[PDB]
Design a protein around this ligand. Structure first.
Ligand SMILES: CO[C@@H]1[C@H](O)[C@@H](OC)[C@H](O[C@@H](C)[C@@H](O)/C=C/C=C/C=C/C(=O)[C@@H](C)[C@@H](O)[C@H](C)[C@@H]2C/C=C/C=C/C=C/[C@H](O)C(=O)/C(C)=C/C=C/C(C)=C/[C@@H](O)/C(C)=C/CC(=O)O2)O[C@@H]1C
Ligand SMILES: Nc1nc2c(ncn2[C@@H]2O[C@H](COP(=O)(O)OP(=O)(O)NP(=O)(O)O)[C@@H](O)[C@H]2O)c(=O)[nH]1
Ligand SMILES: [Mg+2]
Length: 397
């Protein structure tokens, strides 16, 4: 059975974690290899249990007749957007959870836009909490609103599956009868509609290995005796022990080193490929030479830059942005892969300001170099709000 990565996204409290638990229980009735997980086993940290909130992304495994799934359950709270982005970057498809009782909310919109920015190719929708809605008209409206949102963000909104169900009632049924099978219960069958939907709508992924190697540095560790280890998810290409690599960005100059080891969890590998979360041991360099925000790459394949042009969508308040636009001189934070760097905006000649809801173009000068290339997507934040989502269109300096 091929392996596929999926996950749950959506506004705070709409039901992501409860749905994740339900998925493990429902799938386990048809497969003895699946380990069932209760709500408290997913939101397992003391703080998560205390306030009933997802803080850390959780990784759970389950399977269908067709595939083995690794599911990343993401937090919906704005305070943990970094963890949500980190989780979305691992997904081959995402399950957008939308409460039928509340309808789309700011992070319903923001999560779809950000999922697109990180490269999630497909979204399946689970309209949750329908057990709380007795009005069929409202359900139709919520579905229309969600399909409209998906269309607005360039996903095939009229094609995507929109499953109407109750994660809670399905989970309660599985607790009462862990062997409930297909066809026996309406709520459990809605979970099967979702499992069948991810099986048929999320394409079997093809790792992006036919490209020069690049891995954003997530974190850096010094293993006593072994050396400096840079962790990250390989974005493209492959890396083998003995390969020469460049550390690009942030520092005054690019630095070269050699890969002396590749590991994944407690496994020693001789090579890592696109899609792998790995620890890369680097020759000679210390933590003073490799840090979060830099990238490791095939030498000569990407260079550091500070000035670029970009196409940017300016977010509205209801999408996580602001009601007001901005002018030349604006100094927000720019996020490229694992980099966070301040930059200064310069609007094109004749453009006084750019407004929320518009797709505009402008120039940016960063305060430190970043590994940049045409086609690189990014986000702009200011004051804890996502003000723009963009893509680099031209390298100037
Ligand atoms: C044993 O000790 C250590 C450790 O504990 C072990 O860990 C288990 C470790 O084990 C290793 C062997 C191994 O098993 C473990 C390896 C671990 C690897 C971890 C990998 C990851 O997190 C990756 C998914 C991420 O970087 C991921 C791609 C990164 C993660 C990046 C997250 C960024 C968040 C920013 C938030 C902003 O405020 C924001 O509000 C906003 C809206 C920004 C949007 C930004 C966008 C849109 C950027 C895009 O330009 C883009 C394409 C982003 C996607 C991106 O780059 O994601 O060994 C060590 C030695
Ligand atoms: N009535 C009803 N309540 C539900 C349903 N699904 C989840 N809930 C409830 O709504 C609350 C939030 O659920 P939870 O799964 O934690 O939501 P979340 O989207 O994971 N939250 P966060 O964004 O913090 O991660 C809980 O009290 C939970 O029992 C459902 O189908 N029906
Ligand atoms: Mg949750």
């Amino acid at each position: 059975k091929p392996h596929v990565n999926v996950g749950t996204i959506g506004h705070v409290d709409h039901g992501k974690t409860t749905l994740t638990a339900a998925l493990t229980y429902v799938a386990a009735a048809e497969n003895p290899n699946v380990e069932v997980k209760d709500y408290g086993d997913i939101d397992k940290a003391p703080e998560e249990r205390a306030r009933g909130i997802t803080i850390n992304t959780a990784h759970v495994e389950y399977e269908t007749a067709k595939r083995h799934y690794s599911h990343v359950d993401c937090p919906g709270h704005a305070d943990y957007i970094k963890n949500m982005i980190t989780g979305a970057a691992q997904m081959d498809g995402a399950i957008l959870v939308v409460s039928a009782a509340d309808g789309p909310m700011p992070q319903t919109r923001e999560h779809i836009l950000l999922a697109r920015q990180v490269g999630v190719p497909y979204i399946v929708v689970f309209m949750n909490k329908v057990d709380m809605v007795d009005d069929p008209e409202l359900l139709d409206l919520v579905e229309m609103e969600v399909r409209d949102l998906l269309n607005q963000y360039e996903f095939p909104g009229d094609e995507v599956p929109v499953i109407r169900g109750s994660a809670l009632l399905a989970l309660e049924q599985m607790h009462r009868n862990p062997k409930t099978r297909r066809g026996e219960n309406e709520w459990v069958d809605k979970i099967w509609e979702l499992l069948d939907a991810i099986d048929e709508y999320i394409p079997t992924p093809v790792r992006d290995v036919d490209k020069p190697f690049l891995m954003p540095v997530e974190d850096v560790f010094t293993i006593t005796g072994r050396g400096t280890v840079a962790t990250g998810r390989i974005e493209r290409g492959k890396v083998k022990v003995g390969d020469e690599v460049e550390i690009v960005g942030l520092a005054p100059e690019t630095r070269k080193t050699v890969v002396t080891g590749v590991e994944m969890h407690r496994k020693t590998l001789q090579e890592g490929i696109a899609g792998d979360n790995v620890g890369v041991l680097l020759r000679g360099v210390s933590r003073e030479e490799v840090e979060r925000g830099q990238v490791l790459a095939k030498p000569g394949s990407i260079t550091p830059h500070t000035k670029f042009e970009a196409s940017v969508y300016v977010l509205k308040k209801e999408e996580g942005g602001r009601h007001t636009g901005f002018f030349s001189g604006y100094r927000p934070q720019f996020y490229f892969r694992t980099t966070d760097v301040t930059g200064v905006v310069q609007l094109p000649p004749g453009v006084e300001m750019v407004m929320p809801g518009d797709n505009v173009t402008f120039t940016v000068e960063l305060i430190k170099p970043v590994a940049l290339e045409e086609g690189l997507r990014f986000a702009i934040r200011e004051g804890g709000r996502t003000v723009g989502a963009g893509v680099v269109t031209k390298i100037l300096e």
